[PDB]
Design a binder for these strands. Sequence first.
DNA 1: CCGTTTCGCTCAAGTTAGTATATTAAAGCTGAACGAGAAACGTAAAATGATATAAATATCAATATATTAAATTAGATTTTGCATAAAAAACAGACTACATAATACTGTAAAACACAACATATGCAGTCACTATGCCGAC
Length: 53
Amino acid sequence: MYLTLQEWNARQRRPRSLETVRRWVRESRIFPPPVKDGREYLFHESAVKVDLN
DNA sequence: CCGTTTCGCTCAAGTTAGTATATTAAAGCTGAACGAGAAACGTAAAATGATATAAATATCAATATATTAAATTAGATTTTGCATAAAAAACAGACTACATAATACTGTAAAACACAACATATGCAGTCACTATGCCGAC
């Protein structure tokens, strides 16, 4: 039902580095926000990179 | 015959009189689309009606006499309806043997990300020009 960090970024237009994407998570730059499974984050299929300011 | 006024009528805004239901549950009605077998029809071919005349063949009464198909039995027998029961095969009721998954437990690489000092393009911060009629002023 959810999508892994890589499976979500791979679908993006400008696939950034893993670290950078992980940073948009701690900075709540992604809404709807992703949930932490065990060691990886599983975002939503409709989750988008909300760039504000 | 004619006009004028009262009266029968209907429109418009108040003043009263009367009666009281919603969901379940299960049908029932009817316009419209769907899917074969048997007999009346019809053109074509085969059998028959049409048609007549001297000669050939059948029409039939009344009774004697040899002949024969065949229903009428009458006894013989395959045929037909119905189980009984055991030989023979199917198949749960047991069980160890065998190969196979879910699980028990040790061994090892590596995914996934916080944490931390830099590095720096890029968006944001701050000011002037691009581009063209307002407003204000005359006509």
